Ligand binder design. Structure first.
Ligand SMILES: Nc1ncnc2c1ncn2[C@@H]1O[C@H](C[S@+](CC[C@H]([NH3+])C(=O)[O-])CC(=O)[O-])[C@@H](O)[C@H]1O
Ligand SMILES: Nc1ncnc2c1ncn2[C@@H]1O[C@H](C[S@+](CC[C@H]([NH3+])C(=O)[O-])CC(=O)[O-])[C@@H](O)[C@H]1O
Lengths: 230, 231
């Protein structure tokens, strides 16, 4: 699997047909941004792809002097992402950076989004990234962490695999040329349970976290840094 | 409780009222249909408990392709039953529906491949909820499923507050306050006694369910699926 030009071309339709609840989570990210993005601060869209989460945050910022930093290590994604974000006017500028989220600093951040990105790192790298995000968020800041989950209960995992299978069938996933290769990707991805995600978030320092969305085997957590945090 | 009544006024506006106030509701109705396609077995019954106008019933009914099933839709509101009868009568399908005016606390659950409590258990007194779940587990056939969808409470007050505010913002975005019923509906929500996800899971385990999981959530609303072991 590579996030190449072909993937960047079909990405919005690929993700729509394969991630149950994706558009709801994009909407939820924007709603959160209205309440959590602070004046004069930064928001990070980590593994931004074509910038869908970036643009949903950006439409919901009504403060001056914010900036969104959208980062992805796929050159094809970045090229399309920069052009795509340039198509829409807003007062908040976006820095679209080709780079690795394992390396980038998190500074003066009121919000950070990992919208189906952490799953692409090696499992052993996940904690360091979440630790870095917690440290770089300002007090009162929020992280949104959306993932495909695994399930400890194998019978429940099977049911949710089947539901995902039926969802893809209902949405004509197999019409897409990329669908076999995407399925091959998902078959080798290493996903964590909700409990595992909550534990890492706690370990990184987040004083409050919770699952705020789920649909079958996909979902999203929101984690808040306390307003009185050190 | 309070001054809330499920009268003809509420029955008229119900679909719009729920759409503007329950995040995820239509997604949960679609998921119930998807589950029915896999779980509703030939020659068995499905129960829609607290059916209101039949939305969950009809989603199940459209996803049964066996010729010898039956859906039993039960509600104790005369207004909601009267409109539910007429609403279900508007749509053709092979599976018949028995629309029964009655109390879910009293109804027997027999030969059931699937039971739905789609925003209904929250209306019982907390002390009555286990008995209903126990009865549903016992009445499910092996391999059967329960869908239990609720507004949830949250132990972490900061999280509870965030999800309250998100629900507030969702209602604003969807023009909830345009509805005449909105203030009375909010009053109802303000007196209903909701449980946490962990509390629901504990009742389901205590009833006998060998497998349960949250399979949907959106802000402070969501749904659990509980499976009875096969054999
Ligand atoms: N180490 C890395 N560093 C930077 N980018 C990375 C890295 N590893 C993978 N990527 C990038 O992570 C993104 C994941 S897609 C995110 C969807 C988007 N957030 C959305 O809300 O539409 C979801 C998916 O493909 O399922 C891809 O664009 C990768 O190039
Ligand atoms: N003891 C009871 N016995 C029978 N019915 C009852 C009882 N108590 C309350 N009800 C009925 O439970 C239903 C709850 S609505 C269900 C939505 C539907 N399932 C849907 O998927 O659209 C959700 C809402 O009003 O928030 C009402 O019609 C009550 O009359």
């Amino acid at each position: 699997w590579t996030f190449d030009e072909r993937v960047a071309e079909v990405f919005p339709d690929m993700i729509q047909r394969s991630v149950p609840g994706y558009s709801n989570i994009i909407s939820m990210i924007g709603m959160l941004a209205e309440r959590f993005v602070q004046p004069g601060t930064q928001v990070y869209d980590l593994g931004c792809s074509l910038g869908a989460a970036t643009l949903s945050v950006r439409r919901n910022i009504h403060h001056d002097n914010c900036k969104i930093i959208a980062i992805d290590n796929s050159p094809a994604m970045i090229e399309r992402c920069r052009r795509h974000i340039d198509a829409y006017k807003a007062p908040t500028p976006v820095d679209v950076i080709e780079g690795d989220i394992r390396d980038i600093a998190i500074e003066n951040a009121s919000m950070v989004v990992l919208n189906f990105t952490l799953q692409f790192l090696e499992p052993s790298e996940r904690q360091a990234l979440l630790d870095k995000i917690y440290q770089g968020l300002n007090p009162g800041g929020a992280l949104v962490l959306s993932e495909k989950f695994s399930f400890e209960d194998a019978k429940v995992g099977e049911l949710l695999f089947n539901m995902h299978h039926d969802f893809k069938r209902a949405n004509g996933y197999s019409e897409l040329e990329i669908s076999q290769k995407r399925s091959m990707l998902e078959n080798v991805m290493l996903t964590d349970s909700v409990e595992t995600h909550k534990a890492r978030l706690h370990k990184a320092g987040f004083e409050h976290s919770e699952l705020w969305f789920q649909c079958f085997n996909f979902g999203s957590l929101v984690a808040l840094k306390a307003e009185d945090a050190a």
